[PDB]
Symmetry: C2
Subunit: 401 residues, 2 copies
Amino acid sequence: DMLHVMKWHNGEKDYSPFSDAEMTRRQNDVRGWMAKNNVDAALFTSYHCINYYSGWLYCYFGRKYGMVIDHNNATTISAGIDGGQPWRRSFGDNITYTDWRRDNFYRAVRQLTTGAKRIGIEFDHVNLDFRRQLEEALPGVEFVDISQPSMWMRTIKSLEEQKLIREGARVCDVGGAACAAAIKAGVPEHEVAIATTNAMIREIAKSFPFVELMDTWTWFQSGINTDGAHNPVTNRIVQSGDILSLNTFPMIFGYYTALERTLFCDHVDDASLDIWEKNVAVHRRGLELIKPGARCKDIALELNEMYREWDLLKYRSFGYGHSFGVLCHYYGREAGVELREDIDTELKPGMVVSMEPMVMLPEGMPGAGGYREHDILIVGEDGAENITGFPVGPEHNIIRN
Amino acid sequence: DMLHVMKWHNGEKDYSPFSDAEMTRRQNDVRGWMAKNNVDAALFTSYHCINYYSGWLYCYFGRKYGMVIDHNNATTISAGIDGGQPWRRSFGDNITYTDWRRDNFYRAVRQLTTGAKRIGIEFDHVNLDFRRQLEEALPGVEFVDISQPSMWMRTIKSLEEQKLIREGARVCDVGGAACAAAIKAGVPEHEVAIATTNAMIREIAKSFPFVELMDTWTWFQSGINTDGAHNPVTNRIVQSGDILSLNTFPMIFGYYTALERTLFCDHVDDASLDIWEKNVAVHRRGLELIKPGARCKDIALELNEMYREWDLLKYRSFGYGHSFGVLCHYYGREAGVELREDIDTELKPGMVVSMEPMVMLPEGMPGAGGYREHDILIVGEDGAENITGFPVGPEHNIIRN
């Protein structure tokens, strides 16, 4: 018969930016939490939880993936299509399931959880059909949530995580300089984004002995494309006087950093400058408002009042910031740390957060477009350190090429 | 004073590859399903379902996205971070919720599902917490799965879908030409991937009056990196005689196509050539097995016999093919159509299936590496139509740049 679950440990362990002690403390924090709550094993299934505790980021082509952490073991679960890449990239053990049987993944989970009675899973990620299948394949097992305690444990970044986040912020600035240098009246958006992403990919591949070059992208928006922070790249021609939006996102070992700057082609008028100068002032004040001990709601309420002074709150787009770490445009984000009005979570030293005030003026109104700056701050004992070094306002953001 | 569910129809509608009739036919298929099951409204929340029925592919940054369709209306739900971009790319109506209150998204679902008692949601996608928040916001409403019938309806591709898929296959062959042209002993993998992805992005931009240039990527693997079909691009240096894997993935309006080929840098040894000729032989037979009458498991079990003759069956990586349409490496795939040994589903005219037999030999064994070809076939009334034009085997895929 065919193989259902096997080990395909092809090759040796790959380089990782994190030490063995750093990947060990992460897997031990789970073990310490499971022992406090009488949880026998943990089964992670999402991109971000698996990449955090194992260091390996999986590709989801409709297949299930997992990682089981017992009180003594740590094992990732991957598919035959992946071969040995998951074992080379994972901290710990690794097993493989095949496509020849619909329940081969649950066969693999069962091998790593024999004897367990309380398994912790991600209520954030496991869908309805998934939870029913896990219940059927593991009868007599009570399921508890670890997505929330894991989320809180990821909000406090270690020094090694901060060192990688600083390195991502450096690639952000390199991608920004390549973006500013490619902007000219008449260039399409995708030509700007191509040069911006190419420069970051080459800077990442040069800055590590081994690294996977994946997911890194750029959002270069002109004109009405700036009205949304996530608006994809188009083929629109940049015209002189158009509002612009620089957005660089290098992805390094699943970790995410961002540099976002509003720009203008050739020149900036007076009407749009009034909105730009005010949004920069809100950004500068927001940087002051990130301190250890301040609540997320207190930061949004104060900055919202600043928008009321100039009648700009009515055109707000989204929250003032979010947490960092293991996230991307298709995974992650710790919802506990969001600069939103109804979030009472206080900031703590070791958190990596952003300040990104955005105001959006619709078409048919002077200064129509989307205005947004974005910095990254590492919360310290007395304040926060800014790791985004790119120029912010109109002192150097008037691109005259 | 701060809005909850505003309406932000900024700008005008964008170009779509599909006509208004095609987009209406999909939405009417949902209403026909809801009528037979006494379902009052449908609430889609995933990338693929929202992109299939509305034409708009959202960007998830920890935020909830949805699309409610009545028996007379169809409305997408987007966040204030997106602005008018969702309404500009969605077929139908669109409303916007803000990040100021945690339940602002559920206020939008409520405004679109007034009086509804049975609502269809995606059991494939909605997680446990999302399920809990939904019934807390819509008390006294019975939720039923709609992801499975939606999956079976997307398995049959219309002519307008095939027309867009044929164009994506043409962009694949453009990327493959740029890929092979950038291959040489000494070039890093990311330089090959950069030249490959840039050519596809530029070909897409000039192939549509309006188009979104997003998510298109390339996997170029050399040596041991070929042992996994989804192995990320690295900074590994291609060397003489290395086994290679070309993989081009243009993403056009959420629709996915792929061209994957086995290559060799300067030469191919006899041991690996033998494995390569055998795997291409299985690929040719697989192309002939894509028939309307034939079932998925019968295709797999038949091709497995060919591998058993040469004792290569133990090295098979994954299934022989999957269904196309609205999918990507982070969404989609209709699990009903998979060329796997226990899939009793029968092919049908209109389906778009691939033939991608892959064998993986471990390192330290003669012919070590991953061997894989990949063609796309449209299922007709009598047979299939192969829409992949790039050369297959060793006759031309031995690069000599």
